[PDB]
A paper describes a structure:
The SARS-CoV-2 Non-structural protein 13 (NSP13) has been identified as a target for anti-virals due to its high sequence conservation and essential role in viral replication. NSP13 is a 67 kDa protein that belongs to the helicase superfamily 1B, it utilizes the energy of nucleotide triphosphate hydrolysis to catalyze the unwinding of double-stranded DNA or RNA in a 5′ to 3′ direction. NSP13 contains 5 domains, a N-terminal Zinc binding domain (ZBD) that coordinates 3 structural Zinc ions, a helical “stalk” domain, a beta-barrel 1B domain and two “RecA like” helicase subdomains 1 A and 2 A that contain the residues responsible for nucleotide binding and hydrolysis. A long 30 amino acid linker that does not adopt any secondary structure links the 1B to the 1A and 2A RecA-like core helicase domains. The nucleotide binding site is situated in a cleft between the 1A and 2A domains with specific contacts to the nucleotide provided by conserved helicase motifs I, II, and III in the 1A domain and IV, V, and VI in the 2A domain.
To identify possible starting points for the development of NSP13 inhibitors we have performed an X-ray crystallographic fragment screen. The phosphate-bound NSP13 crystals show robust crystallization behavior and routinely diffract to around 2.0 Å resolution, sufficient for the reliable identification of binders. 648 crystals were soaked individually with a library of chemical fragments at a ~50 mM final concentration. X-ray analysis of the majority of crystals showed no bound compounds; however, 65 bound fragments were found within 52 datasets using the PANDDA algorithm. The screen identified over 50 binders with fragment hotspots in both nucleotide and RNA binding channels that can be used as starting points for design of novel anti-virals. Whilst these fragments do represent useful starting points for inhibitor development they have not yet been validated as inhibitors in biochemical assays or as binders in alternate biophysical assays and are not expected to be potent inhibitors without further optimization (see, for example,34–36).
Residue numbers in the entry: 2 to 203, 208 to 336, 340 to 593
Write the structure that this text describes.
Amino acid sequence: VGACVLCNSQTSLRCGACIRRPFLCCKCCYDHVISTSHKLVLSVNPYVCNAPGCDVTDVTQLYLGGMSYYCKSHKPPISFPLCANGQVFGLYKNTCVGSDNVTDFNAIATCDWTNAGDYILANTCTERLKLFAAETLKATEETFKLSYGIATVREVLSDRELHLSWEVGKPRPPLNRNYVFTGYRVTKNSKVQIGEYTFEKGAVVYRGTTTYKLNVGDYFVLTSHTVMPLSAPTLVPQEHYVRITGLYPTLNISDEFSSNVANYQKVGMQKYSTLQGPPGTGKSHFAIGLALYYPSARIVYTACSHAAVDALCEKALKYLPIDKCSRIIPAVECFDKFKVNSTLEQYVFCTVNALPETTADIVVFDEISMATNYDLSVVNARLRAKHYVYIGDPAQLPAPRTLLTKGTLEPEYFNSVCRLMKTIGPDMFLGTCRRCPAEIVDTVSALVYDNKLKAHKDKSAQCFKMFYKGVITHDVSSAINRPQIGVVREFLTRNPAWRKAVFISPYNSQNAVASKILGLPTQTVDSSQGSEYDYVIFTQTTETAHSCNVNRFNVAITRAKVGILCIMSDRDLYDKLQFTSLEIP
Ligand SMILES: Cc1ccccc1-n1cc(C(=O)O)nn1
Ligand SMILES: [Zn+2]
Ligand SMILES: [Zn+2]
Ligand SMILES: [Zn+2]
């Protein structure tokens, strides 16, 4: 028994064909089963023919005779159908409303989540459907990883490199940091974990979360966890205030955080606020300075990845009393300079999926473009706070949609918070970039920020761009452009100062080849987010939809502090690059 996902009308009915099995009142349970392929219906018992040897599960072909359900061939003389009069039989038949259109709820439950339009509807629908779509999408993603085969150690060629044997019949998952395997050893009766691993083409290379003398017979599987149901909404009801509520500003603040005093008060005059922070604008500076401005405020700093949650710890280590902090870790290594697992410690730093159930004066959700509507609902479910601050940049990169292949996901569809920022604008906007040269800022400002991003540094005069298509070769699940890597090599022979540069590309296979031919550190654009390097050498590799993505190309050129070389394939972003042009040797 539970609340309907369409009309809230109390129900004792659940759809058996939906992987989340939402409670559906007789009206909505009916309009769903007759308009889709979903026919299995669950209540206290399953609506299935209780006759020996019968396989009828469709509720339209089932009748309730006595207290057991049968079909047309197995029903008693005294029976009435379970599915008629626009209602499926179940408790609370008098309390049943119905919706003007269930069509939105149907496409959510039937879609394979491989199209961009599936994620659009999952973000525009009613709030209760945003929660249901988040579970359905995430439970689908946790199940698709079971479709991938098992990799087994056929040979241990050396350290750091392996020879893998893959399962038959099932496909193989791509080998990049977006897929994180988990190993096992063949014990007596069952198996035991031996850390998490990531792989890449060589035989394959690996990188282990822990070090081991792993041997033949060990196997790796993408660990899929549970998808618990969502109760709280993605966003609490917004409440604007006339005074600062529940918070108390300081009389003495330092000149380091003085330019934020207006926004720190803005945080106290809203139930929740949004802060867009382009690269180099000082987002973690903002989040920690907010603590000094409201000194006695219990603040919970949170994000999805431990890396983002640890970057806040580094700044809290630089400004806040250490005995007032705590790092929450569930029983991969992370920041271990605060007392671990102390929920009653003023400043709490934790990931979303590990969040305890507690209250706080302020909550700081960092790097919000990575979040999903599932994460947003968990934060509101575990954390009941007075003010919610959402820090991020919807012009940066979103969470990887491992099923999405057709179409492109726009920033307003990343999550509910990014929808507000890209439509009604963000409550706050850090508009000065103190990291990149002027040519980079003057490029991403017009590209994704409506010319509202101001450069603090001057022109570095060391930003260059070349238009070289070259030769594109493909492999299993990545692309490789060696003539672009070769152009970089010929550039490096005439610019040996650019050998302290980081090589960045949209494809990790391009990084692997570039690591062998150039010897520069490698980062995919998605792995480079949140990090700054002096020099960056970027090869777009292709002009597919993946490499031309403006939120990716924004991150691709903003990691530079001094200079950058961009070997471009797409003419569009090549002309949008305000860089000194170079010719092809
Ligand atoms: C990077 C940045 C951009 C803008 C404003 C402040 C900062 N920042 C200063 C500090 C520090 O003093 O540690 N951290 N971050
Ligand atoms: Zn269904
Ligand atoms: Zn309903
Ligand atoms: Zn039957």
